[PDB]
Design a protein around this ligand. Sequence first.
Ligand SMILES: Clc1ccc(C(c2ccc(Cl)cc2)C(Cl)(Cl)Cl)cc1
Length: 1142
Amino acid sequence: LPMVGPLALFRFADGKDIVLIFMGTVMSVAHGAVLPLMCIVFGDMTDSFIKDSMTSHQSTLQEDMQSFAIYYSIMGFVVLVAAYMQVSFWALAAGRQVRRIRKLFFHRIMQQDIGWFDVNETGELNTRLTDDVYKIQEGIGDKVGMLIQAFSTFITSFIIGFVKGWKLTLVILAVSPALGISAAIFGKVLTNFTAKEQTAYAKAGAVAEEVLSAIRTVFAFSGQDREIKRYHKNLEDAKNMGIKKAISANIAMGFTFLMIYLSYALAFWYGSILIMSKEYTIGTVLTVFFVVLIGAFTMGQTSPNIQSFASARGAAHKVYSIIDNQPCIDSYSDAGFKPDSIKGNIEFRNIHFNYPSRPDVKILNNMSLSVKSGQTIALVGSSGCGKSTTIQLLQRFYDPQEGSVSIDTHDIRSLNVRYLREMIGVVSQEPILFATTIAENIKYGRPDVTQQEIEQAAKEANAYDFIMNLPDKFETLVGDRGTQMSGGQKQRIAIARALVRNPKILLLDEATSALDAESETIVQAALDKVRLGRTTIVVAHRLSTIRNADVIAGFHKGDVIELGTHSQLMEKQGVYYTLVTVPPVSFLKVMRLNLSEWPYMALGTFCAIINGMMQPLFAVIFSKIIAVFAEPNQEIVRQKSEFFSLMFAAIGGVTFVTMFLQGFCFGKSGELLTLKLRLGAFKSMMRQDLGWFDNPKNSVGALTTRLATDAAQVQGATGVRMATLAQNIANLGTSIIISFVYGWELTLLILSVVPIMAVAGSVQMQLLAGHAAEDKKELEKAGKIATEAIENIRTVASLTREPKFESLYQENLHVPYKNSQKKAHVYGFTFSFSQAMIYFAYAGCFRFGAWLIKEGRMDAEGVYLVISAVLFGAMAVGEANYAKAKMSASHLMMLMNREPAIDNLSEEGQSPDKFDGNVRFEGVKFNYPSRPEVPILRGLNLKVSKGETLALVGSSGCGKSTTIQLLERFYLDGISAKQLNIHWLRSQIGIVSQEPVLFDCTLAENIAYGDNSRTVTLEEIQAAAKAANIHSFIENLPQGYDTQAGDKGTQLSGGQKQRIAIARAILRNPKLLLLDEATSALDTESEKVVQEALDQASRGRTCIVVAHRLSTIQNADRIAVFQAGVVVEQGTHQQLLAKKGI
Ligand SMILES: Clc1ccc(C(c2ccc(Cl)cc2)C(Cl)(Cl)Cl)cc1
């Protein structure tokens, strides 16, 4: 997308904004510099500690630490002041820029031509306003400041690192390709296994969605278990691939960890080697290592601010392009002539018009008609071809592309737009009143009269009928929006607003339609009465306005043909001759699902606690490496440095193997849990009632996405949640115990400062709740008035009251500005304290450690071990979705055990071998949850016995919706409804689904599907297909019945689909067939073939015709009707055939 550079992004910065920007940039540079200086002083402090320890195998530690502590405090103060001031200046600049941007943007929008409004209109502009203003505010806000600080810190870190230790800096840098190639291998393996995992998961999700989409036919057939088998097998394969992906990702992360630790080890070994030669001192190596580390990590961390800068740049580009767009018609400029008086005439000389958007359409061609003032001229049209366009034009909404206007020897182009607009009075068909009092709404219009005639106008508009006895005499506090008016009321206030001193001319554009009869009469009377005294040309189609007239205007497609009497219009064949015209599940209940796989979770937790404890060991090894650089014997130094670098590598390897094992076990547990949850959820889906599913929240898409996503998400709350919490607990507990043992004093001091980091945020949240509230509310209401302005641009411009809307917008914007400044200041203080607290804690803790060292309670490395352990524990926890996983698990649990509302999978009940053929329904009062309000079902008492051919037609909304669904046992034959063997009833039926849905498998498999209790034999499949007449077309196929049919829905006709559906149905060879108007949506020949096949299959077999056309119903015995689930209009075929004459 287009993006502007820095020069344009800040174009709307004045001098006041520029000074703030300059100060912010300079202060941010200083802030960025401060951290590398911190590292330099840290290295010097380490050197001083080592010197004191070396002397004892002096008091200079006390004074040296005192000086370094004063240094640390001054760094703290400078960072506090600098960071607060940087954030404050940048936020203030953002606020001023955003305020001016909103002002100018709305000003320009209101300026744009209507020919430009119609091109993007309200949605684009409101989106732009909200989103893009957010983007621009976030761009030039604190984010650019953080970018500048990142640059400064990176450059300063590199320069100090080079200037101090060019050799060791070069070594650290040259170790970077190691991490680079580690990441390369990471990406390779990740991409390969990720693609494989997507393929595997999709292979099962496809079957999931195939079943869910066609659940009706999937379940109507006794094939609810073969689906379970298919899902089980596909999900087992997906489990294998998923565990492969998990182990791959874990090994990649472990290799990254191993390589970073190996980089540490090599760097420290080289530092030792140099120190032995006495080139770099321990302080120097520590300084250079930490400065390079901080530089790298800071560049990484401010990578995300780059994206914010870029998005802000793009949004700014579009906003600025809107700002600079100059409308062809200037609604604000005062350039033009203002004739002191105007006779009020109107003329047009072949004004050619085309909409700026899609100018190919040409409606106004050769429009030439004049109306001398003091006259009223009627208008007509069929599609509103010309009238709307010309009424828009007279308002200067669209520039006359070719023509001349000679209004009293004046051209509308050459006169002031505001004077022209106010010179005439026009109101839309339904002008949505602005969110104000009715008095203020009538005041809108001509402010020339403010109160005195504003109250008088009511008497003219026939609105007073309620105003005098309204809730208030003229409506203070009435508001509107919350209160509702009748259409006649809105129209009456509209005519009042029009008649508030409309100077000469008054027009109305289809201002009569969409009105009740009483309102129609009232408004017609009002229009008639207000016609007198001024030149009126109203666009309308009503008969009353049609008959009343003094002149006529005729252009049915934009063809001016008539300008005279009414009788002439009649003679002109006009319309005057066509007058006829969810309890959040707890942790324990979630773990009850992996209760089965606990063996894997146990080893996972054990290896996780080992992984966590490894971090404190890394802190302790850091303490020991720092301490062991103070040994006078050089050989001992080499031995210890070699051993500790080796132990660094060993901790890396332990972390690597432990991450690998963790990956293996937690992946396996998570995949087993996912398979179990998916299988249980699918089983619950199948068994549950049919009326459940059609619910909008139970949409096929909803269930599919739930199965795909929430299933995996649930892994986030059983093992990995336990693993992460165990790792964190082990890390902090071990760190705290080690620190306590080394010395409870410094342990307590660092622990006591730990609260100050976060607890200080309580005030931040207190002041930020107000921020969020004002943000949502003020955005909503300011944008609401913006949407009112833009969406009613027609009226807003025609009212000539754009400035008044601007003033309302600005007054609304006032409070957000103050709240934004408060937010800037409070965020600035919180950020400054968060930044300076680390420096202050360093200073205080190290001074205390010096004291304890002198007293004798803490060894030289005691302070380093305790501080490093606590700091690295904090970092580890900070590095280390749970609520989302809990929510998904709650939904899945309530799903898998919701209720057996209509137990369908219940294979209970007794099934006599013989089915007597009774379709009797006794005492069943039910109603569909889809249509419970509408009478669906009552004490149904329908009758059909064996050998019948009953037909039916539903007068109201496809009566099939009732009888087949009920009889199909979706919602009894002499036996109780639920006592019967539902499996037997579902098995012994010839129900044909409406739309034949075939399954993604062999045609042989689809044929065999009709039965799933017993396997299939090819001989019988052929028998059924030939009996189904489908063999005819199947005779030409790649392999025939067994064909995979790799087309997957191309080489199949509707008739072929119906034939295969019938073959599937009759595979059971049932003795009672049922239809659901399936034999439809096909060509006449296809339907004839379908009926021929069905009749052939009906040879010596009972059926119930439920077809939709007489062609099928020809071979029928009796026809029926059903209303509200009760027998009605039962009769013989000939009688009801006479009924449905059609
Ligand atoms: Cl497992 C782990 C621990 C610490 C780290 C980092 C780290 C890097 C350098 C140093 Cl000296 C300490 C910790 C962060 Cl958390 Cl600070 Cl980003 C990374 C991974």
